[PDB]
Every structure is written in structure tokens, then in C-alpha cells.
Write a protein that binds this ligand. Sequence first.
Ligand SMILES: Nc1ncnc2c1ncn2[C@@H]1O[C@H](COP(=O)(O)O)[C@@H](O)[C@H]1O
Ligand SMILES: Nc1ncnc2c1ncn2[C@@H]1O[C@H](COP(=O)(O)O)[C@@H](O)[C@H]1O
Lengths: 21, 69, 402, 301
Amino acid sequence: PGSHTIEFFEMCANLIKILAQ
Amino acid sequence: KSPPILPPHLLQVILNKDTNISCDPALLPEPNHVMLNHLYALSIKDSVMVLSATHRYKKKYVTTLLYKP
Amino acid sequence: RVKIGHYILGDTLGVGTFGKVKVGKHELTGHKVAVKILNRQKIRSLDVVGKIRREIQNLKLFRHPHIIKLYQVISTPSDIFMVMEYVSGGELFDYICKNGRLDEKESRRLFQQILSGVDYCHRHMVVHRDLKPENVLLDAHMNAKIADFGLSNMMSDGEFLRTSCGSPNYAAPEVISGRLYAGPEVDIWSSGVILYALLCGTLPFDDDHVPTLFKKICDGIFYTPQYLNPSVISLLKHMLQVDPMKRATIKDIREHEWFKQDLPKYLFPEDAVAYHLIIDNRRIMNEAKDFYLATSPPDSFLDDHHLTRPHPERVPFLVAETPRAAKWHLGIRSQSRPNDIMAEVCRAIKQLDYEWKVVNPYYLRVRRKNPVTSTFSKMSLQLYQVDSRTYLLDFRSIDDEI
Amino acid sequence: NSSVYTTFMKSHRCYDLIPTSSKLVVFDTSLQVKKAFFALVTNGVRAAPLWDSKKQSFVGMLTITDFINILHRYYKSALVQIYELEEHKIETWREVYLQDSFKPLVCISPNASLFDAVSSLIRNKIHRLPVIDPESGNTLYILTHKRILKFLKLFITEFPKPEFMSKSLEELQIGTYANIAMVRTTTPVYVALGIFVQHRVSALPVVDEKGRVVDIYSKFDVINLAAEKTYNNLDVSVTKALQHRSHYFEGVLKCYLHETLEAIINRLVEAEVHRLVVVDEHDVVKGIVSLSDILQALVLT
Ligand SMILES: Nc1ncnc2c1ncn2[C@@H]1O[C@H](COP(=O)(O)O)[C@@H](O)[C@H]1O
Ligand SMILES: Nc1ncnc2c1ncn2[C@@H]1O[C@H](COP(=O)(O)O)[C@@H](O)[C@H]1O
């Protein structure tokens, strides 16, 4: 049912995508 | 009240450290418990993001790396 | 007289973290126990309800030759009684003053046993602040037993501590400077100054004027006079490193040549009946560590030629990038104003439909619902300061067991 | 004979094989495939679990075999730049290569037996085996025949040593001795890949004109073409494509029919190599004893 660790990575990517310029 | 000074423990990256050439390419040194769960990343190049973190399972450690467009 | 079961309480012998400790005597057999008394009238007045809960939690599952055992914990509608193992002889703080310092024979023997317990605590993710010669007690057979865990705290992975609760002396510089720490290194520093008193009979960092005392600490200077054996001085300078990253670890002490000298093997790991096989299999694992852990490469970078046997499965990557020739960052960093950063990270969070909760002005607890498996994944955002004009946003991961 | 290694592998779990600290690479399926192959070289790794970000789950493996299959397939030869590899994502290539060859992801629980791991390896005929945590859904490690036999060699007293360990290979009848896929010294790399595709073997012993082994082209030695970016000229020989190790390779690991099974196993774990080339007095290759063959003779004695 999905990897907890990858989900953590997946989440961080979405945040940095906005923050990083 | 200022945001707390960054503890020096987090400035020890196991992936920036290089392993012995005689050892198995997949092995890593033993990490301390305090670097676990924290997110590490490479410099964003092209369009691929390279995230990293170290997680524990019982008493075994695994440093997962993810490449993502 | 107040009795607990068949234990009548008598001579008061404990200062306590606040609450008196008395000796218990079994009315039937005269068996002696040590009872820590905590009346509800006093503790409730403060917010130490979780603090002593924390102390009991840590000590409840401990079982070590050199740590005072917690036998029971009995509650009345008026008070709480911590029934512990009693030992006669008091602190080894009184083993000093009496006698003349300690020999390398004796001071080391105690240091070994004391450290063994410290190790045991850290292995159970329990750091023990306030680790001083007054908290180390001796039995009839002069064996050191670590005692007061009032300021102890359970270490959690990925998390630092702060608080700063130790004694004026015996406290690590990062503690007195109110800076966050991992846990064990603070304990090492306390043990480092303990070994000094065992060898010298005095403290390495002392001053009547307290503000000038904390200065004497953060500066890594102390005198090792005359008779002090050169082998142990190298251990003290190591255990009392102001820089926590260069400061000695238990691993670094167990392999130290001074500490190896005539220490009992029963301390430390080495050395339905499968337990005699599960303990045997484990020894075979640690024996060939090269199978479970990656060793560190040789240090010298001034050698003209370096001969060594390369692993066969890492030759192509090796021979191509090395014949005649990226860093990992921690989270992300910026140079913006700290509170202006926090304003924009919430904008990014609100833009992704996340559930965030503020714990500190620089610490969030953001929660997301996975739009596929409907699973809640959590993570913690903590802002730090790196340079004099640069901040660091840290991404932590939170596991949740139900 | 039957039952001591069987009992051993049935008592220990997969968790015991897992290193106390290792590194695991995971690719997103929407990543370009050539970018991924370089990433393998980057981290010094053979394979990586594939994460379907759309499905929120792992979907398979990206190994060196994939690189071999990409190359043999889309090899416009040879001066025209390989186009189907430059602009090609993982997911899009699994829409082509995986079709008519569908091998669904096979994993295993850490708390699962070591016996069923070896059983899963042979039953599914795969060299990799992702040890996946049932809860959390985390991949912990990728299990191999190499890792298993090593641990086997490591964690056993040979006081209850079985009979067959002291018996030769000729009588034990372990290994492959018919239709040995191999290449000549002069054989083009591309031709070697085609052999790798239809025979699906882990390596190809390099023979001379006399049919005598002088080197070996394992599937692992293919990423050297990705490491040195020399993957566009497959016209070259195998022996030239193996020059990158050159004087630093100390010879091809062989064995004989007359030496014991224990002799073969011990020699095989010291070398950290997957297979041994069976050979006669005159170095003429006559068979191949792989880790696949050995571990099969331990689950099924
Ligand atoms: N080059 C080869 N030619 C013929 N058979 C092989 C070759 N390589 C491996 N085998 C056999 O194929 C099976 C699997 O080998 P492997 O792919 O090395 O695990 C074993 O029975 C091997 O003996
Ligand atoms: N029989 C052998 N003799 C010498 N080297 C080998 C042999 N088999 C594999 N190798 C090498 O071992 C490395 C790992 O390949 P593998 O055996 O597939 O794990 C590669 O560099 C191979 O070329």
C-alpha cells in the first residue's frame, strides 16, 4: 500500500518545487 | 527569541562520506540515531530532484535514494 | 511510623531531586530497601507530573549490575513510593575526602563499572543528565551504582534535547550554553570530569564566581599535574573536548589502551532453548563486521601509490572516474529574514492543501492525506541558523504506530 | 544428506541477511531511462526498485539486463545516434520491453524465512529479490544468491558437515554442461548482447579459437559502456570492451570436476563472484557452475 519513506520524499518534493527558485 | 542554531550532528552526511573500495558497494557506515528521518538532497540539476533520508528498521539501517523528475 | 506493606520506614538518607529518600526495613526479615517518597501535595503544585513519570518510565525496565534497580512503585491517595535497591556506603563523593585520591588500579575499576551502566542507559535510548559522583553510590563490596534519574530523558531518533538541567560543574559546554544536543556526548563530558576527580581528588572546572565558572568550561583548558599517567591524560583531553564532534564516544573509550587494562569481560556485549543459539548466532555476526558494515578508507592522501584489493562489483565505476581525477545538502537554506521565510513556507503548504500545525514560530507539524491509498503521512519542519546571515530549513520524518 | 542446510535456511529470516547499514536507490517511472543508467554508475549499484508515482507503489526492477535489452533492441548501427534511448522514459520502455515478457514484481517480507527466499529465487528465476517491509511498504534490501551463500558460509559450523560437501561435482551432477553459451575473443559486443537476450544467462565465457577460456563477459561488465559512455560503438570486440580492467583482473575463476563441492563453494565466496567456469586440463570450457546451481542443491539436496 505504498512506501512510507517514498511518500515522505514525495511530499518534500512538492514543497521544495514551490520554494526552490 | 531566534531560531535555534543548527546542531553539528546533522552536518555529517553518510552519502558524502566515501566507503572503502574493498567493501560491498551497497554498504554504509553505521549512522547515529539523530540523523535518521532527516531529508538530504543533491543540487537540482537538469530537471531531476535527488532526495535522500536514512530510516531504521528494528536494528537495521537503510539509506534510501530517490530520483524524481 | 509509616509502613509500606511490611517495610517500615526509618532513617532519612536522601536529599532527593526534591522528595526525601528513606531506608525501608522489612518488619519480618529486616531486609533493607531504599524508598523515594513523593507526596501528591508537592508534585501536583508544579508541572513535574510528566517529569517523574519520565523518570519512572526509564528506570522501570532497567536491569544492570551497576544501576540501582527500581523494584516497585506504590501509590496511596496521598503519596507515591518508589521502592529501590538499598546499598550502604553512600556516594563515592565520600570515598574521596576519605582516602587519598584513587590509584590507577582503583579509580579505573570504578570508572569501568560506572561507564558500563552509562553504556547500558544509552543502549536503551536513555540519557542521564546530572551524572555526578553524588549520584554514584557504593554497596558493601564497594561497587558503583548509578542512582538519581530525575533529570534523565529518553532519546528519540531524529530528535535533539536541550533543556540544560545538569549541575554547575559536570555539565557539558553545549548544555551550559543552552544549545541543543543529541544526548550521549553530554553524558561523556560528565564522565570525563568524573574520571578527573577519581584521579586527582578535585574538580577540573570550579570557581566560586559562577559566571566565570561557565567561562572556564567552554574554554577547553585544564591541568593534568605531575603524577598523572600519560595514558589517561589522553583520555581526559578526549572525553573533555569542547567540540562535541571530536569528543570521545563510548566506542572510542572501550578501545582506548588505558581503559582496556584489566577490565572484567562481563561488562559490555561480549562475552524452547533457542536463546543459547540466538546469542551464539549474534556473536558470529559481530565477528565478521565487514558483512554488515562499510569500513572507513585509509586516511593518507600523500602516498605516491596505494595498493589494495577492490571489490569486483565496483571496478567499472572505479576505473573510469579515478584513473586521472556532488555533495549532499541538508534540507534547504536561504539568506532571507527568518520570519519572512516562515511566511512563505506556509503559502507553499496552503498551496498544496496540507494540514499544518504550529508548535513554534519556527517549527511546524504538517500533515498530508495521500490521494491514492488514503494514508496520512507526517513530517516536521524546523528552521535553523547556520551562518551569521544564513538560515536552514530542516525536513524531518514522523512515523506513526497505532 | 537431506536436512541441515534446509533446516538452517528455514530457521533464519531474511532480516538476518540485511546489512546493519546499506544504501538503496529508487527511480521514479517518469524518469528518462538513460538518466537512470548513469545513476546506477553514479552510486555504484546494479539494480533499483521502480516507483510508479501515479499508482503509489513499487512496480519492478531496473537492472543491467534492461540496459542490455535497450541496446540490443534499438541499435541503429552504428554511427547514427541511438534515438530510442536518448528520448525514452522508464515507464514508456516498460510499455514495450515488459510487454510480451511480463515479469511482475516479486518481493519478500523481512520476517519471511530464508528458505522461502532461496525458494522464491529459484521458483521465479530472478537474481534480485526486494526485501519489502509489509507495513510501511518500505524496501529494505535487495537479496541475491551471492548474499545468501556468503551468509551460509559465514553462519555454520561444519561439525555436522554433510556427505555431499566432500564429494566431487561429476558425481553430484551440479551445473550446466550442455549448450554452453559463450563468445569468441573477437566476438562483437552487440552479438554478445543478443546471446544475453535469448539464452538469458548471467555471463558469457570468452573462448579462443581452440575453445579455451581466456576471459569472461558478465552482464555486470556491460555498465562499463555506460560508465565510459562508450555504449554507442557496439561493433568492438568483447575483449576490447573488457580492456577497462586489463592487468587488474588476475585471471578467470575456474574449477574442475574432480574437486569437492566444498572446495567449489569456498572458492566461490572468497571471490565474491556469481559463477565458476568448469574446465579440463587444457582450459577448454566444459561447463558452468553458478550460484543458481549450488543454492538449488541446498534447498533440494
Ligand atoms: N553461459 C552459459 N551457458 C550455458 N548455461 C549457463 C551459462 N551461464 C549460466 N548457465 C546456467 O544457467 C543457470 C542460471 O545461471 P545464472 O544466470 O548464472 O544464474 C544455471 O543452471 C547455469 O549453470
Ligand atoms: N568466472 C569469473 N572469473 C573472473 N571474474 C569473473 C567471473 N565471473 C564474473 N566475474 C567478474 O565479477 C564481476 C561481477 O560479475 P558477476 O559474477 O555477474 O557478479 C564482474 O567484473 C565480472 O566480470
